[PDB]
Amino acid sequence: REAKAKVSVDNNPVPTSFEKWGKPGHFDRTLARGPKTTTWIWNLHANAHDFDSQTSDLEDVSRKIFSAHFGHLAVVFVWLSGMYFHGAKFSNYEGWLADPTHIKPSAQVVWPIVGQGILNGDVGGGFHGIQITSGLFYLWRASGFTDSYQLYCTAIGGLVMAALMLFAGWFHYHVKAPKLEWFQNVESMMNHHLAGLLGLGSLGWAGHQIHVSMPINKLLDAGVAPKDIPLPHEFILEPSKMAELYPSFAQGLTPFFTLNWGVYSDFLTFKGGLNPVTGGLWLSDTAHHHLAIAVLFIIAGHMYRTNWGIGHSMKEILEAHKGPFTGEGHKGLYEILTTSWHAQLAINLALLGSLTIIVAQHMYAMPPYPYQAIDYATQLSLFTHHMWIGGFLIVGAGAHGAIFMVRDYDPAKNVNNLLDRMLRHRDAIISHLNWVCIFLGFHSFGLYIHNDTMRALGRPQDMFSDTAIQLQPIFAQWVQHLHTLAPGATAPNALATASYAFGGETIAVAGKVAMMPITLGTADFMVHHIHAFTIHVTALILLKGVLYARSSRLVPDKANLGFRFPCDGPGRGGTCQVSGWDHVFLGLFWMYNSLSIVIFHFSWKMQSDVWGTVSPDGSVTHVTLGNFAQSAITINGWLRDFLWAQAANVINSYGSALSAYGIMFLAGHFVFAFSLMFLFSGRGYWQELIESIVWAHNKLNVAPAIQPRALSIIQGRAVGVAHYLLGGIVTTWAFFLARSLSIG
Amino acid sequence: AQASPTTAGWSLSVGIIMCLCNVFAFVIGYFAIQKTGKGKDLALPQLASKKTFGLPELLATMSFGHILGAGMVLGLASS
Amino acid sequence: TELSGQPPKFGGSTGGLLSKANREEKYAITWTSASEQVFEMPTGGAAIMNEGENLLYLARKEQCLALGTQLRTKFKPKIQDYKIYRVYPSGEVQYLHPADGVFPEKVNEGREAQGTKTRRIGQNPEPVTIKFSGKAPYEV
Amino acid sequence: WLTFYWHWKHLGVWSGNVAQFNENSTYLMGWFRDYLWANSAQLINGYNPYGVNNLSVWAWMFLFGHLVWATGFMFLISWRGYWQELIETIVWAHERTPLANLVRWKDKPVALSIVQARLVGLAHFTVGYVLTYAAFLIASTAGKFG
Amino acid sequence: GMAHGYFLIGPWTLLGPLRDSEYQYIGGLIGALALILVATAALSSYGLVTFQ
Amino acid sequence: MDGSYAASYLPWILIPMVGWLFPAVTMGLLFIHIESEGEG
Amino acid sequence: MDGSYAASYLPWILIPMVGWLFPAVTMGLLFIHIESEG
Amino acid sequence: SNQVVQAYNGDPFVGHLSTPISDSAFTRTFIGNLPAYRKGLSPILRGLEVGMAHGYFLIGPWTLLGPLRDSEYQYIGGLIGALALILVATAALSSYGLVTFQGEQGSGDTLQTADGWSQFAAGFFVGGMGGAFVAYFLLENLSVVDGIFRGLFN
Numbered sequence A: 001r002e003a004k005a006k007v008s009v010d011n012n013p014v015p016t017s018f019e020k021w022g023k024p025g026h027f028d029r030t031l032a033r034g035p036k037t038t039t040w041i042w043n044l045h046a047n048a049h050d051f052d053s054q055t056s057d058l059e060d061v062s063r064k065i066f067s068a069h070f071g072h073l074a075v076v077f078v079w080l081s082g083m084y085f086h087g088a089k090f091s092n093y094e095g096w097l098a099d100p101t102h103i104k105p106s107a108q109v110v111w112p113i114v115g116q117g118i119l120n121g122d123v124g125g126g127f128h129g130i131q132i133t134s135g136l137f138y139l140w141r142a143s144g145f146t147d148s149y150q151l152y153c154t155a156i157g158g159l160v161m162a163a164l165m166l167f168a169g170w171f172h173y174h175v176k177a178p179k180l181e182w183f184q185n186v187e188s189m190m191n192h193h194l195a196g197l198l199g200l201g202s203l204g205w206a207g208h209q210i211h212v213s214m215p216i217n218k219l220l221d222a223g224v225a226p227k228d229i230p231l232p233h234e235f236i237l238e239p240s241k242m243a244e245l246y247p248s249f250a251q252g253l254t255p256f257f258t259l260n261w262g263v264y265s266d267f268l269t270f271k272g273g274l275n276p277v278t279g280g281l282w283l284s285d286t287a288h289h290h291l292a293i294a295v296l297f298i299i300a301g302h303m304y305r306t307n308w309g310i311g312h313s314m315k316e317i318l319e320a321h322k323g324p325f326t327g328e329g330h331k332g333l334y335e336i337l338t339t340s341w342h343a344q345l346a347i348n349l350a351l352l353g354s355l356t357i358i359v360a361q362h363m364y365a366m367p368p369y370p371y372q373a374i375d376y377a378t379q380l381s382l383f384t385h386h387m388w389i390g391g392f393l394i395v396g397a398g399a400h401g402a403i404f405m406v407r408d409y410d411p412a413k414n415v416n417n418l419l420d421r422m423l424r425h426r427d428a429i430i431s432h433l434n435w436v437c438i439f440l441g442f443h444s445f446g447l448y449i450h451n452d453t454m455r456a457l458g459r460p461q462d463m464f465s466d467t468a469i470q471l472q473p474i475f476a477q478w479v480q481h482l483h484t485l486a487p488g489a490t491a492p493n494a495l496a497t498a499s500y501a502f503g504g505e506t507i508a509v510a511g512k513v514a515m516m517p518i519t520l521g522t523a524d525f526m527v528h529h530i531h532a533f534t535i536h537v538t539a540l541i542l543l544k545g546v547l548y549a550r551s552s553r554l555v556p557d558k559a560n561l562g563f564r565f566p567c568d569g570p571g572r573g574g575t576c577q578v579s580g581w582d583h584v585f586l587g588l589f590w591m592y593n594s595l596s597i598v599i600f601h602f603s604w605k606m607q608s609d610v611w612g613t614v615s616p617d618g619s620v621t622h623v624t625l626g627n628f629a630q631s632a633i634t635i636n637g638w639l640r641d642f643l644w645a646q647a648a649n650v651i652n653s654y655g656s657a658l659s660a661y662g663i664m665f666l667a668g669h670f671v672f673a674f675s676l677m678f679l680f681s682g683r684g685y686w687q688e689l690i691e692s693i694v695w696a697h698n699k700l701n702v703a704p705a706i707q708p709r710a711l712s713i714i715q716g717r718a719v720g721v722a723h724y725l726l727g728g729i730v731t732t733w734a735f736f737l738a739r740s741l742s743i744g
Numbered sequence B: 001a002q003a004s005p006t007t008a009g010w011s012l013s014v015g016i017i018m019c020l021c022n023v024f025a026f027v028i029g030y031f032a033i034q035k036t037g038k039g040k041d042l043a044l045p046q047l048a049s050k051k052t053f054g055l056p057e058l059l060a061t062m063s064f065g066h067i068l069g070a071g072m073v074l075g076l077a078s079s
Numbered sequence C: 001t002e003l004s005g006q007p008p009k010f011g012g013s014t015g016g017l018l019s020k021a022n023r024e025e026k027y028a029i030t031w032t033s034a035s036e037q038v039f040e041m042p043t044g045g046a047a048i049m050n051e052g053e054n055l056l057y058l059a060r061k062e063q064c065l066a067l068g069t070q071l072r073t074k075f076k077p078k079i080q081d082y083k084i085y086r087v088y089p090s091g092e093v094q095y096l097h098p099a100d101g102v103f104p105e106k107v108n109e110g111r112e113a114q115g116t117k118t119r120r121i122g123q124n125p126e127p128v129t130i131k132f133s134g135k136a137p138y139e140v
Numbered sequence D: 001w002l003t004f005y006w007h008w009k010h011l012g013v014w015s016g017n018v019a020q021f022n023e024n025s026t027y028l029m030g031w032f033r034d035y036l037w038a039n040s041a042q043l044i045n046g047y048n049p050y051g052v053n054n055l056s057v058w059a060w061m062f063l064f065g066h067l068v069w070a071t072g073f074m075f076l077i078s079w080r081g082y083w084q085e086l087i088e089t090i091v092w093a094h095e096r097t098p099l100a101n102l103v104r105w106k107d108k109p110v111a112l113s114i115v116q117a118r119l120v121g122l123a124h125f126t127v128g129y130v131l132t133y134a135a136f137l138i139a140s141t142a143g144k145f146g
Numbered sequence E: 001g002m003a004h005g006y007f008l009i010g011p012w013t014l015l016g017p018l019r020d021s022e023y024q025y026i027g028g029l030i031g032a033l034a035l036i037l038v039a040t041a042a043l044s045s046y047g048l049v050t051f052q
Numbered sequence F: 001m002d003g004s005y006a007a008s009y010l011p012w013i014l015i016p017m018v019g020w021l022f023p024a025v026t027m028g029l030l031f032i033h034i035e036s037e038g039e040g
Numbered sequence G: 001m002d003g004s005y006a007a008s009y010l011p012w013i014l015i016p017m018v019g020w021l022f023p024a025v026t027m028g029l030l031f032i033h034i035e036s037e038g
Numbered sequence H: 001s002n003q004v005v006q007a008y009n010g011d012p013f014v015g016h017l018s019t020p021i022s023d024s025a026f027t028r029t030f031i032g033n034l035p036a037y038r039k040g041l042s043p044i045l046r047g048l049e050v051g052m053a054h055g056y057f058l059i060g061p062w063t064l065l066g067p068l069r070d071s072e073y074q075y076i077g078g079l080i081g082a083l084a085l086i087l088v089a090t091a092a093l094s095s096y097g098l099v100t101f102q103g104e105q106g107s108g109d110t111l112q113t114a115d116g117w118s119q120f121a122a123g124f125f126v127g128g129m130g131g132a133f134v135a136y137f138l139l140e141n142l143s144v145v146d147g148i149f150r151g152l153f154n
Ligand code: CLA
Pocket: A065, A066, A069, A070, A073, A182, A183, A185, A186, A188, A189, A192, A193, A195, A196, A197
């Protein structure tokens, strides 16, 4: 399988066997000798995917990584097919599609036993189950699914694909294992990921939208009912069935090649607003967008030189960028991103988590799927879900930046490049970031404290409010104004605004509001500065962990200690948590804090100044009656009018289909309190307690041969932070879900 | 309220706009392409500037000429 | 006496000496190199040692010792002739490492024994037996 | 646990509605909503967007105890060395910022010690515990008058 | 400075433009203060240049 | 002295700045500069 | 702020003294004592 | 030598860098000629100028944002706030000098001594009180300043 390519594989490097499955710890030479202490077990899980600590061959590591990628893709295919099958044979997708505005999207039926059958609440049309917030029904309606058999077929295809990915992983780790030369083709890999994966993907999805999503949805919104819509392929068998909806189809693909594109203005629109029937983005707009994105990505996938002389050498581009401030510039970065997996992982985790948070922010205010803006639970759930995914990916980006610093950083190849100079003024960077975090904390949280003290003393006129000392976010208001004036001027062909959150019509579907102008005042200014503050503190922790992983004034030989170590003794005043791993540990807490305040802001602002009902007068009555302005300026406001008030749904959820949310609420509280034990103590006390219990077992000859050892310091920290995040996020999950499911 | 295009390419859109953009891109490639005849597939003799050094150079420069020509056509068509 | 050697080729950093070097004390590492090489700076970033003699000033003794371990453990012709001194603001220089021209890892004659207890660990006197004194079990 | 039990049972006894405690103290959600959430309603309204009543100090002190408790968490979870490195960067900053160079510390700034950090985190934890529970106790029992 | 600031208030107090207004003495004070400020700047510039 | 033009508060302070502050400051800088006995 | 109790002029000046003068004096004395000799 | 960032004072092993912000001609000339660093000055003159400037600008915050800003005593309140903050700053300066120059006195510069730092504190106190009072006096008499600037009394 050469085909005059740059492919180079090894025909049989690893034999297939089952014997190593019976030796837990084969990948670690320190664990192969068998357990003697309980720590042996824990480390077996800690280094499972730590391929660098298993072998010093970059080629074998790349092969393990490739096959692990295939395995993870098989797992995600299995999960996606499970979701599709549960929508197929276990959901009310058809009863919902027949009448969305009067039925709740349900899935996952519970077996009636031990009382748990109560969780299958009535969702409409006689269906009993658990209301789902993932928004799968809206996505499937956007895709054009009409029959549950098609969800079943998608599940079958996904399971077939999962088997394919698993076979591919096995085949490329045991049969044809690609060489290290093949992975280092970053120019080719980039060309393909831009053109083949992204370009072709959006191109085919635009085609599917034009042939399946757009016609079916055009009819669906007009009330034609699902069972009366012809099948998606009857539109391909009958061109007149496509020309009746879009007369532009009657001219064929002749205007396309002749650049006569305007003819296609029937199905390739630039409406901008929302669909008045369902409250989602126009599928014509999404298809046009996918077409443009596909062309852009395909054109981008031609920049880099591969096997034909034409193209861009990324090494030459990086080395050609150097100025008076930065020395030799990006020289040596090609060698880093070609010989180091952790540098790539850090960059990609950072950008992917940012993209995920951007996805959350762009989907909450521009509802792309039909009838997703009406459902407040699904909106809030998707928002916070992508928020947390992005936060975790960013913390992991910091972790792997530090890992690269400790393991793959070579000072001999980083002589006066960007990384070298950053290491040479990290003190300035971190001191200024320290100051910026302090200035933000004083000038965001401190403003809330001022308001609390002034209101408590009976001095409302001395507060930072819209009615006293105003903090008007003038710039955001100006940009919103510019957005509301773009269609017709700075956006000539666009029919409406990009989003009504900046302003415009208060689009409402059914009895509820879909999207109205989101006003910004003093409380919004304060919350945005809280956001900046928390983001800065988290980034400070992570960046200091990365830059000081190799050395510091305290520990000039920190690199030799490794990336993951508890400390370097109680000397030098005390050196606990000096490692980069411990910086990731702290950045985890601060990411949790930042994202928690972000999602709380989202929930309260949407429920207060956006979400609500609309009576046949134009007048809007919001969920919690616009209390954001006068209450979100003090901490007591967030305690009373947000936490105390909106947790009434979660606490009184017993005896209904939401009692599980109260159960998980208490469970998250308990897991936070449980984490506190791992976070506040030390290993020595637990080892002494284990010594006493081991004596007690010696009294009756129940002493295990594997000596019980207390959790290591690093493991104690990992367990504590894992339980802390789990408990807090599950608490807010239950709270948000119950609240947004008990507001209509 | 759509941007007006042109249907048949006839004498204006083709030759006068598309082919001239292709020739401009061919000149820009012949001047600025670093590796011109480094492709694994070689071109047939030399002839003129319609195609001279390597099939990949001609293919890439025709693609860039098509980009330029589509842009200039949809521009002069008033958008 | 007078410390000799060329400073390593370095563009500068913010992790070097502070006011302590001139108010309190400073340290110096000297070493001979078989060629112009690149080493890692204990204060962050990379530097270039010259072929021949190299003299480098650092803020703390542990930094010089980290540089010494790196010289002796990370280069093809191992640099082990390095010397570490302590410099005072009066210009005084106190030779430090290796103390007796031989690394402390391996035994060498002429060295006295300090901090050596003739007894065992578990044979320390009970604290109550030495209370209301200025001593601890590991001191008498 | 002592004071929660005592206060919930005694609130029930004083209001004559011992049924609430006797029937809801069996599951922990009963404690979460009928004791903590409920008796807080008065306290958290000592001051609000509408004015101030006699529970303003108690609400403010409730939030004060929350703040002090979390600040204790700060010292308890994060351990010295990180802070010593941060303080080292801040020391670098001060020595190199003009005008402020006219001024120098008499004592070299260093991070709190390990035992000191435990003591300080625990001190904040205990201050917050006592103050927030005292605020809740007083405000609830006084706004209900038992 | 005591002697000079004391006597410099007079000229503008009795002969300045605000002498025939409700702000006569305030006008004199403002004039004398501005003059003493300029004089201080002159003295300081002199010191700066002659003792290098 | 008044002003119906926009931002007529600008001359109010700009005239003393252009007439007093800028001249005094620039003459002081130039006096110091032309009297500096550095090298030559 | 007022007071129907007798000598209501006493807190008038006594609250700043306990809150400003006394703390500033004690903190200054203790600061000088902390940083004594050298 | 296209690089604009170099070692500080020709020593790459001192914890600093020479940058356009830290060690450029403009920064050297401006910072070096502020009253703190201007060559030849006596500590009391440095203190006087610094205090003038600081007492002057410290009038504003409480004047426009303090509790008396909405009263018939706005300017007086801003004045009082400025004067008290300057008194506390003066006590701080005096105490700093008291503890930092206890033993032998260096010969480098007069500011870095016990006598010199106390003289700088006296200058700061006097200049700060004066500048705060002149700012308050200008604000209180803004109407006569307005008539002076518009030629209303001609
Ligand atoms: C057009 C060519 C092409 C395509 C589409 C891909 C696509 C992909 N690559 Mg690959 N790659 C390519 C060229 C291509 N690559 C070349 C030329 C090289 C050599 C330099 C590499 C070397 C490379 C490496 C080393 C790795 C990848 C990885 C990945 C996957 C990560 C992204 C992801 O998970 O998205 C979403 C996932 C999916 C949509 C699942 C579908 C996967 C199927 C099997 C591939 C697409 C179908 C196939 C093209 C047939 C289509 C026919 C029909 C549908 C029209 C992804 C599916 C990474 C990986 O394995 O991640 C798991 C990885 O480690 N690529």
